[PDB]
């Protein structure tokens, strides 16, 4: 596949989760952002693919599965078949990657989005492939039990601007955050 996209929201301590959920209470605007980014395809008749870990899939309220308008791929070394509502189950990122290149998929899919968790982000980041990382930096700390892996600042260059990503500091529910896009060129 040409390139990857990963999207995550992180707080000051690099936490991305707590007790099987997000560390902060709901932020509407950030959510819409996530939906818009992962769902929008730039080609008619095609859809985006989202890849996620087992825990992440299960963190989504059952009635909200799978993420509508995207091909949901869940990774697990343990499951024997895709969880109810998921489109495909893969045993590794590589497997998922191969799957995508498969004929059936290849023609059906526009963009690939990595939606976490930890181990998933890490694996995608290590692939020597063109990758864009969309980060929402929440400028506050919340107790977290799950964290974003460390990004190689030598590989991933922070863009100073990106089409359709606001530059300013955003605020909502008395909380501030900023969007940042990092890019790795292979
Ligand atoms: N802040 C944002 S945007 C965000 C995004 C995602 C998740 N989260 C949060 O983080 C937590 C879930 O993340 P996590 O890190 O704990 O768990 P996940 O990555 O979602 O799930 C871990 C499981 O997933 C499977 N897995 C993970 N990486 C794999 C790989 N490379 N190949 C095969 N299977 C792989 C394994 O399943 P098996 O054990 O069955 O093999 C592993 O036990 C929740 O709190 C969730 O809310 C936050
Ligand atoms: Ca396990």
UniProtKB/Swiss-Prot annotation:
Entry's family note: Belongs to the dihydrofolate reductase family.
Q: Which domain of life is it from?
A: Eukaryota
Q: Where is the DHFR domain?
A: 3-184
User: Any idea which positions bind NADP(+)?
Assistant: 9, 15-21, 54-56, 76-78, 116-123
PROSITE patterns in the record: DHFR_1, DHFR_2
Its annotated pathway reads: Cofactor biosynthesis; tetrahydrofolate biosynthesis; 5,6,7,8-tetrahydrofolate from 7,8-dihydrofolate: step 1/1
What is this protein identified as?
Dihydrofolate reductase
Enzyme class label: oxidoreductase
Q: Which GO terms describe its molecular function?
A: dihydrofolate reductase activity; mRNA binding; NADP binding
Catalytic activity line of the entry: (6S)-5,6,7,8-tetrahydrofolate + NADP(+) = 7,8-dihydrofolate + NADPH + H(+)
Identify the InterPro entries for this entry.
DHFR (IPR012259), DHFR-like_dom_sf (IPR024072), DHFR_CS (IPR017925), DHFR_dom (IPR001796)
> A single GO BP annotation from the record?
tetrahydrofolate biosynthetic process
Is this entry keyworded Oxidoreductase? yes
Biological role = Key enzyme in folate metabolism. Contributes to the de novo mitochondrial thymidylate biosynthesis pathway. Catalyzes an essential reaction for de novo glycine and purine synthesis, and for DNA precursor synthesis. May bind to mRNA.
Q: Which of UniProt's keywords are assigned here?
A: Methotrexate resistance, NADP, One-carbon metabolism, Oxidoreductase, RNA-binding
What Gene3D superfamilies has UniProt attached to this entry?
Dihydrofolate Reductase, subunit A
**Looking at the Swiss-Prot or TrEMBL record, what is one Pfam family this protein matches?**
DHFR_1
Q: Which GO terms describe its cellular component?
A: mitochondrion
The gene name on file is: DHFR
Return the EC number.
Answer: 1.5.1.3
Q: Does the keyword Oxidoreductase apply?
A: yes
Record-annotated residues binding substrate?
A: 30-35, 64, 70
Q: Organism, per UniProt?
A: Gallus gallus (Chicken)
């Amino acid at each position: 596949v040409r390139s990857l996209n990963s999207i995550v929201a992180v707080c000051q301590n690099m936490g991305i989760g707590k007790d099987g959920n997000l560390p902060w209470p709901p932020l509407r605007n950030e959510y819409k952002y996530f939906q818009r980014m992962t769902s929008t395809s730039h080609v008619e008749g095609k859809q985006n693919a989202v890849i996620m870990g087992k825990k992440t899939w299960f963190s989504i309220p059952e009635k909200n599965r799978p993420l509508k308008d995207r091909i949901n791929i869940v990774l697990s070394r343990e499951l024997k078949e895709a969880p109810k509502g998921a489109h495909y189950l893969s045993k590794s990122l590589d497997d998922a990657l191969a799957l995508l290149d498969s004929p059936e998929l290849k023609s059906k899919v526009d963009m690939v989005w990595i939606v976490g968790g930890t181990a998933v982000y890490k694996a995608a980041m290590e692939k020597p492939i063109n990758h864009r990382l969309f980060v929402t930096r929440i400028l506050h700390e919340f107790e977290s039990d799950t964290f974003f892996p460390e990004i190689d600042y030598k590989d991933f260059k922070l863009l100073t601007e990106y089409p359709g990503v606001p530059a300013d500091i955003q605020e909502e529910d008395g909380i501030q955050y900023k969007f940042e896009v990092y890019q790795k060129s292979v």
